[PDB]
Amino acid sequence: DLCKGKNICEHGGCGRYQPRIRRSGLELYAEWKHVEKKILLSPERVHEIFKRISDEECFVLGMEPR
Amino acid sequence: RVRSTLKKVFGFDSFKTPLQESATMAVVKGNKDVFVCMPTGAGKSLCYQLPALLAKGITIVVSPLIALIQDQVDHLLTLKVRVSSLNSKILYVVDEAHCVSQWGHDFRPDYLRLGALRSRLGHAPCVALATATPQVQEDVFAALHLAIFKTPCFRANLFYDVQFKELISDPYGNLKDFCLKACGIVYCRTREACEQLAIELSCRGVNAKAYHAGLKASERTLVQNDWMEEKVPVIVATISKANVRFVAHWNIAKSMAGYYQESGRAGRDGKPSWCRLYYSRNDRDQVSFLIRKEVAKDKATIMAFDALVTFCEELGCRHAAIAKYFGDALPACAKGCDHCQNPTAVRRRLEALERSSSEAHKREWNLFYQKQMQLRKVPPDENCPLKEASSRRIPRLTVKAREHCLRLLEEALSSNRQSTRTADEADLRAKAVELEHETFRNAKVANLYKASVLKKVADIHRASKDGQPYDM
DNA sequence: TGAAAGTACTTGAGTAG
Numbered sequence: 194d195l196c197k198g199k200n201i202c203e204h205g206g207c208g209r210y211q212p213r214i215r216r217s218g219l220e221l222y223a224e225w226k227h228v229e230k231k232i233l234l235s236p237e238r239v240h241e242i243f244k245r246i247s248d249e250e251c252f253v254l255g256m257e258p259r
Numbered sequence: 260r261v262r263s264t265l266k267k268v269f270g271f272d273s274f275k276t277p278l279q280e281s282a283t284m285a286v287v288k289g290n291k292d293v294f295v296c297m298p299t300g301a302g303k304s305l306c307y308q309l310p311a312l313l314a315k316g317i318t319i320v321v322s323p324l325i326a327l328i329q330d331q332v333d334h335l336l337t338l339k340v341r342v343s344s345l346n347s348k349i350l351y352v353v354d355e356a357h358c359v360s361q362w363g364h365d366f367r368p369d370y371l372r373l374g375a376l377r378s379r380l381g382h383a384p385c386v387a388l389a390t391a392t393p394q395v396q397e398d399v400f401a402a403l404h405l406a407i408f409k410t411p412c413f414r415a416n417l418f419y420d421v422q423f424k425e426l427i428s429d430p431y432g433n434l435k436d437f438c439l440k441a442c443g444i445v446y447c448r449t450r451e452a453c454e455q456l457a458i459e460l461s462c463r464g465v466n467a468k469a470y471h472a473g474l475k476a477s478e479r480t481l482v483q484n485d486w487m488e489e490k491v492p493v494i495v496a497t498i499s500k501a502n503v504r505f506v507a508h509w510n511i512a513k514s515m516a517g518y519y520q521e522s523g524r525a526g527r528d529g530k531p532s533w534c535r536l537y538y539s540r541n542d543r544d545q546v547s548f549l550i551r552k553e554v555a556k557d558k559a560t561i562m563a564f565d566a567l568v569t570f571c572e573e574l575g576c577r578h579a580a581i582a583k584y585f586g587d588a589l590p591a592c593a594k595g596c597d598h599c600q601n602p603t604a605v606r607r608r609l610e611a612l613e614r615s616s617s618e619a620h621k622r623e624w625n626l627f628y629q630k631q632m633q634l635r636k637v638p639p640d641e642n643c644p645l646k647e648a649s650s651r652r653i654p655r656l657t658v659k660a661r662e663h664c665l666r667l668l669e670e671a672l673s674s675n676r677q678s679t680r681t682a683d684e685a686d687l688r689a690k691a692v693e694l695e696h697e698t699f700r701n702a703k704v705a706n707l708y709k710a711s712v713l714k715k716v717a718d719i720h721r722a723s724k725d726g727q728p729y730d731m
Numbered sequence: 732t733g734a735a736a737g738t739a740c741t742t743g744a745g746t747a748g
């Protein structure tokens with residue numbers, strides 16, 4: 194709830210923006226507004242995203258790393 | 260030294276706009292007050308500081324904006340000018356004509372002092388320097404009460420066009436695209452003018468930096484210097500470059516000349532700067548609410564805002580409309596105006612806007628009623644027989660209305676005397692005073708007062724018809 | 732022909748020099 198209203202990655206670096214994820218059935222879509230526009234988020238891509246999350250950054254999410 | 264001053268003294272004399280030379284002459288010849296109104300970047304410092312360098316005494320300048328005063332002083336110090344900043348040869352001419360005007364959104368002043376100094380040195384140059392518009396111009400001719408140097412064809416460096424938010428599915432996306440097809444400074448209405456719009460634009464990939472009242476002065480100077488060297492192309496400001504690719508207004512400005520001034524800070528060299536206006540009916544009604552509650556807590560403001568509204572909703576050239584507003588002749592301008600580039604597109608857009616004009620229910624109806632009704636909008640002489648007659652607890656209850664109600668009560672009492680043989684009129688005066696005062700304290704609105712006095716006179720008639728004396 | 736209620740989610744949305 195606190196993290197949904199942030200569309201910009203401020204804190205740390207990575208000054209880029211964050212897309213809106215929309216679920217259509219079994220597919221995810223990263224509807225980049227203007228920063229192409231719609232990309233079907235492949236599960237390999239989300240796997241690559243998740244593999245980089247630090248242990249602290251997943252324990253704060255509630256998911257114990259172990 | 261009308262022209263012998265040259266650029267060598269401060270920095271200027273080169274006849275920037277050939278009548279710029281005469282701008283000195285208009286002061287040099289002492290032609291009373293000359294209405295210097297030119298596009299931004301016209302070197303007005305030549306117009307009203309050269310006589311300051313050449314005055315036998317002082318030439319006090321009315322540049323309210325202290326930051327502006329300090330910037331002028333230091334920029335002239337870079338030009339070796341004996342000017343001193345008194346804000347907080349020249350001590351810092353009736354300058355900044357918008358300062359004395361509410362249309363230039365600079366009518367935020369105090370006493371005279373600088374104005375008092377100018378009135379003292381009326382023998383010294385008395386000049387008035389982008390407000391030469393019959394409404395605004397006559398306001399200067401009335402409130403300030405002074406040759407018009409208004410630019411003959413205003414400025415053809417802006418591709419004026421109006422896009423309606425209702426017609427556009429994504430007004431944020433539309434303005435982002437317009438900025439893409441064009442630095443930039445953007446104004447809009449209040450309620451955190453910068454913050455939300457700048458955040459949306461930045462989410463649109465267009466970095467927009469805020470400049471608001473609550474922002475720190477360090478943030479102000481940082482964003483200003485960054486915008487000077489193109490570090491931040493897009494700056495959003497409330498009312499606060501020779502390119503300026505867009506000066507579009509997300510919401511309507513406070514005043515017609517306010518909009519002119521906020522869109523007139525583009526094209527120092529004369530390069531095209533587009534400039535677009537976004538209009539919404541709800542925005543119009545909201546600002547009408549704001550101006551009405553401002554004047555309530557004066558008719559010129561609403562008159563000029565209605566003029567702005569009909570300007571944004573008229574079928575014709577924007578430069579022609581501003582000529583009607585600024586008093587110039589027919590602009591006869593080429594492509595560069597929305598009606599000039601395509602009359603059919605403007606007419607179709609206005610027709611589409613007209614066609615698309617049409618606990619939560621409580622507030623919705625309240626706002627509707629207020630917006631639909633707003634647009635629809637003496638002491639007692641010698642011997643008034645009323646207790647505390649000099650009171651206004653009942654709104655819109657004229658003293659003549661009180662006299663008429665008292666006369667109705669008095670003829671009722673006369674009939675009661677003829678039917679029941681009361682004492683006399685001498686004490687009937689005090690009795691009527693007491694009755695009217697009691698009716699006053701038992702009613703709140705004018706209609707309620709009339710209803711209460713009618714009920715009381717009906718009761719008096721009933722008592723008279725019953726035959727018994729009108730007792731307490 | 733003739734199921735329906737609590738909790739999600741899912742979007743757009745929303746006062747000055």
Ligand SMILES: Nc1ncnc2c1ncn2[C@@H]1O[C@H](COP(=O)(O)OP(=O)(O)O)[C@@H](O)[C@H]1O
Binds near residue numbers: 272276
């Ligand atoms: N007559 C001129 N010839 C060449 N350059 C000039 C001339 N006058 C002004 N400039 C430059 O243009 C700048 C504009 O100064 P300013 O008086 O604030 O313009 P504005 O008319 O918009 O108020 C000045 O700083 C000056 O350096």
